[PDB]
Design an enzyme around this catalytic site. Structure first.
Site, mmCIF file in Angstrom:
data_model
loop_
_atom_site.group_PDB
_atom_site.id
_atom_site.type_symbol
_atom_site.label_atom_id
_atom_site.label_comp_id
_atom_site.label_asym_id
_atom_site.label_seq_id
_atom_site.Cartn_x
_atom_site.Cartn_y
_atom_site.Cartn_z
ATOM 1 N N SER A 74 24.324 -33.335 -32.279
ATOM 2 C CA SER A 74 24.611 -33.943 -33.589
ATOM 3 C C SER A 74 23.536 -34.886 -34.101
ATOM 4 C CB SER A 74 25.975 -34.625 -33.584
ATOM 5 O OG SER A 74 26.987 -33.628 -33.557
ATOM 6 N N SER A 122 24.449 -40.079 -32.953
ATOM 7 C CA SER A 122 24.465 -39.549 -31.609
ATOM 8 C C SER A 122 24.846 -38.072 -31.557
ATOM 9 C CB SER A 122 25.367 -40.409 -30.732
ATOM 10 O OG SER A 122 26.697 -40.340 -31.196
#
Length: 260
Positions: free
Chosen positions: A42, A207
């Protein structure tokens, strides 16, 4: 003794750790496997949203552009967009959901509007990132198979790219401000750098988690009297649980933050 400490931690895992730090106050750079490839996971969402903002800046995409969420396209972890099947949403709102909540359907909607992984990779090459490559959509990009170059970056490249996005002229003032606010407002990374960040520091981060026991984070930290410090921490090819990966990133963050 950062190299020695990270090497000891890495040797305790069956995998690979990559770290990059650029302190723009002292202008000191430091990395551990900084030029090696790691899965984006991500952490790519910042880069897809930067591409969308760059498109809005040049008029290639209308600021109020919308796209429909189709039920068949709702993928794993879409806590904002899974309420919107059969409805249209602003692409700006899809980037907000991708950045704040890591919403996968939202990130795919953005990719599908801007020309996909190939368009994000072209935008990255256009701003001087020679290494990062986005190849697939969510959730396939989380495969993180060792040796597979698809959907990878390097710790140094993410630090360099985030610095370019925030301090150079890749984005308009309004666009780099919106991107920074989205990263500050990130709601899903409390267990990572934020869990050990000393009082007095602001943070803008993003993150990711992936297969092969992977975890990563790209961040910038600063104070009113301290110029931004760009950080990349990536771990891959381990047998660690998600909670264990979070602890590893937090413990690595503690080592980096110590000299301050």
């Amino acid at each position: 003794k950062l190299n020695e400490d990270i090497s000891l931690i890495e040797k305790q895992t069956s995998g690979r750790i990559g770290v990059s730090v650029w302190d723009t106050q002292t202008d000191e750079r430091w990395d551990y496997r900084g030029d090696e490839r790691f899965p984006l996971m991500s952490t790519f969402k910042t880069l897809a949203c930067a591409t969308m903002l760059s498109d809005m800046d040049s008029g290639k995409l209308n600021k109020n552009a919308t796209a429909r969420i189709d039920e068949r396209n709702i993928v794993v972890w879409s806590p904002v967009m899974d309420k919107l099947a059969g409805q249209s949403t602003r692409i700006e709102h899809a980037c907000e959901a991708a950045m704040l909540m890591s919403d996968n359907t939202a990130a795919n909607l953005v990719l599908n509007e801007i020309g996909g992984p190939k368009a994000v990779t072209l935008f990255l090459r256009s701003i001087g990132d020679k290494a990062t490559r986005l190849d697939r959509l969510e959730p396939h990009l989380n495969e993180a198979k060792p040796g597979d170059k698809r959907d990878t970056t390097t710790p140094n490249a993410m630090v360099n790219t985030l610095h370019t996005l925030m301090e150079d002229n890749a984005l308009s003032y309004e666009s780099r401000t919106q991107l920074k606010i989205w990263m500050q407002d990130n709601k899903v990374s409390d267990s990572l750098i934020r869990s050990v960040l000393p009082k007095g520091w602001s943070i803008a981060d993003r993150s990711g988690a992936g297969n092969y026991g992977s975890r990563g984070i790209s961040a910038m930290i600063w104070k009113d009297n301290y110029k931004p410090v760009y950080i990349s921490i990536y771990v891959t090819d381990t047998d660690l649980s998600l909670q264990a990966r979070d602890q590893l990133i937090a413990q690595i963050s503690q080592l980096i933050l110590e000299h301050y």
